Amino acid sequence: APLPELLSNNGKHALMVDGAPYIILGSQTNNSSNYPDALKDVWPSMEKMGANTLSIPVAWEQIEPVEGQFDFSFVDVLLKEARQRKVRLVLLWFATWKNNAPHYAPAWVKLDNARFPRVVKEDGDTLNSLSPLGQNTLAADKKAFVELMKYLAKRDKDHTVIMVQVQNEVGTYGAVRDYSPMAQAVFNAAVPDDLIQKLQLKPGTWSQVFGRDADEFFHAYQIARYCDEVTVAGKAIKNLPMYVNVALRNPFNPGLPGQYSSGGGTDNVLHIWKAAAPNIDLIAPDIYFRDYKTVSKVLELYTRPDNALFVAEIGNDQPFARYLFPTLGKGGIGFSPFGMDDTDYTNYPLGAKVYNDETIEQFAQVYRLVNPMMREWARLSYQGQVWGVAEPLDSTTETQKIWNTPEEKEQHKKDRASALTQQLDLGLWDAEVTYGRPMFWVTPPEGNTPAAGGALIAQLDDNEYLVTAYKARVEFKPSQELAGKKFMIERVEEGRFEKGKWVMERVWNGDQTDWGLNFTDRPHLLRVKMASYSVQ
């Protein structure tokens, strides 16, 4: 089997696994699940969820508890047990930074500030965040990362591990950058020529070149460099795809760096990160916003010709499940809900209040739409045209229920039906996606309670589309005036792929096609052929 690789071409992207595009329909563990004993509490969720890929930490403290004394006993067991369950892995390298901090570095690292120095604030106080300009730190992290990758080269010939995250949520809370004498010496010095030439700027010192942004861009540049060097070193051993995951700032109202995690790949510093760390394959958003407007904005910012979309973290509460659809519609390579294990921890108010089969089942339901076509979908998304949408109104609040005049009620229902109707330009044909209405007749949509639906569409040919959707109606129509022809559905087939060949189960027709294509919680994969026809 060939190595996994992130391919990029013509504004589009694919995670290759075993020589073809692949989608990560993932589960991520809680942060303390990276031990042999905890795996029994991980696997049952993954099976209930139907995930193909587990994201799980491998901690520097665990593999190198004493300096030079390595321990891959966790990695051994994890590999074997993944293989028994025929799932893949994304290993998360928790090392110099895990959520800005060194807690997962071995004690001989995190307790020796002299050797492995922290970020100093402008006021001279010290933050528990390791400086990207500590050369011993970089050397030490590199060396352990290399041993991990050596373990993979020796013991993972079939690439059970498909990708590695290098650090977890890098940056600094509480200051913009390192203000140490060591850091200040670099800040006062000329900006590296490499960055100047890539950005096509005038040479000068950090403050001369970037002004108001010098402190934050400096920290991003130094962090990116460090992560790049770590990545290069590991990939020299085994050239897996590697990525970084971002503690996002609010894209509409970020506040100041240091309120958010300064130096990470936030939307304002993506240009710095891409310039500085050409060996990092992509920069992944960690999504804990619940509201459709903010989530959608994040997906837009992180989907770039130079950046494959991977939702490396998202909340595991019900509202988050539907963001699978726009993720996949943007050509994303994967989606990884956080905290999908039974190790007795919930990060509520971020994720679900109660972790039970119902929590898992919200994701299982959407995953069951994609799993039966995963490779086909993956191919279409890289090489062709795909689309995807989620229900665009969040669930009605109690504040909103309380204020629910007879003419006012009517106007609001109208407003909401319009908001809950989405248009997709599919070339010669459009789709109209609507949420929360009967399977029969044309009563306006009123939304699902809770908000939950979505759809996937892939273009097979000029008049032919793959469609599957969830608690929604999909209706097709011409994209342009027909100049006197009529149109109809030629044929809608429900079916599946077997050995990459379409197998028809049944034809949808009559009531099933009179009123759009109506989907509940169950999985149906459709091929939809449209026709215009003359009546002259």
CB-nearer residue toward its own copies: 396 or 512: 512
Enclosing H/E stretch for 528: strand 526-533
Window 223 to 252, contacts with ligand UUU (CB under 6 A): 245
CB-nearer residue toward its own copies: 180 or 262: 180
What angle (nearest 5°) sits at the alpha carbon of residue 14, between those of residues 8 and 15?
115
Contact, 119 vs 128, CB < 8 A? no
For residue 21, the minimal CB distance to its own copies (Å) is 28
Window 273 to 332, contacts with ligand UUU (CB under 6 A): 286, 313
Q: Which residues contact 489 (CB under 8 A, 6 or more apart)?
A: 476, 513, 528, 529, 530, 531
For residue 295, the minimal CB distance to ligand UUU (Å) is 15
Name the binder of 35 from ligand UUU, Na ion, its own copies, none, CB < 5-8 A by kind: its own copies
Name the binder of 486 from ligand UUU, its own copies, Na ion, none, CB < 5-8 A by kind: its own copies
User: Is the preceding peptide bond at 349 cis, omega within 30 degrees of 0?
Assistant: yes
**Residue 347: strand, helix, or coil:** coil
CB-nearer residue toward Na ion: 184 or 479: 479
- Judge residue 181's burial from the number of C-beta atoms within 10 Å of its C-beta, 0-12 exposed, 13-18 middle, 19 or more buried: exposed
For residue 137, the minimal CB distance to its own copies (Å) is 14
350 interacts with ligand UUU by CB under 6 A: yes
CB-nearer residue toward its own copies: 219 or 471: 471
CB-nearer residue toward its own copies: 55 or 381: 55
Long-range (24+ apart) CB contacts under 8 A made by 5-10 are 5/239, 5/241, 6/241, 6/281, 6/282, 6/308, 6/333, 7/382, 8/305, 8/306, 8/308
CB-nearer residue toward its own copies: 107 or 236: 107
34 interacts with ligand UUU by CB under 6 A: no
Nearest-angstrom CA–CA distance, 513 and 523: 17
Contact, 164 vs 234, CB < 8 A? yes
Name the binder of 498 from Na ion, its own copies, ligand UUU, none, CB < 5-8 A by kind: none
**Residue 133: strand, helix, or coil:** coil
For residue 326, the minimal CB distance to its own copies (Å) is 24
For residue 173, the minimal CB distance to its own copies (Å) is 11
Nearest-angstrom CA–CA distance, 483 and 63: 69
Site string for ligand UUU, 162-201 (x = CB under 6 A): ------xx--------------------------------
Name the binder of 479 from Na ion, ligand UUU, its own copies, none, CB < 5-8 A by kind: Na ion
Contact, 40 vs 185, CB < 8 A? no
Name the binder of 201 from its own copies, ligand UUU, Na ion, none, CB < 5-8 A by kind: none
- Indicate the residue type of 231: T
Name the binder of 129 from Na ion, its own copies, ligand UUU, none, CB < 5-8 A by kind: none
31 interacts with ligand UUU by CB under 6 A: yes
Structure tokens at 465: 């589309």
Helix 73-84 × helix 135-155 angle, to 10°: 40
Q: Which residues contact 461 (CB under 8 A, 6 or more apart)?
A: none
Nearest partner of 313 among 18, 23, 24, 15, judged by Cα = 24
CB-nearer residue toward Na ion: 329 or 339: 329
| Residues forming the site for Na ion (CB under 5 A) | 13-14, 331, 381-382, 425, 479-480, 532
For residue 360, the minimal CB distance to ligand UUU (Å) is 17
For residue 316, the minimal CB distance to ligand UUU (Å) is 10
Provide the binding-site residues for ligand UUU, judged by CB under 6 A.
Answer: 31, 99, 168-169, 245, 286, 313, 338, 347, 350, 510-511
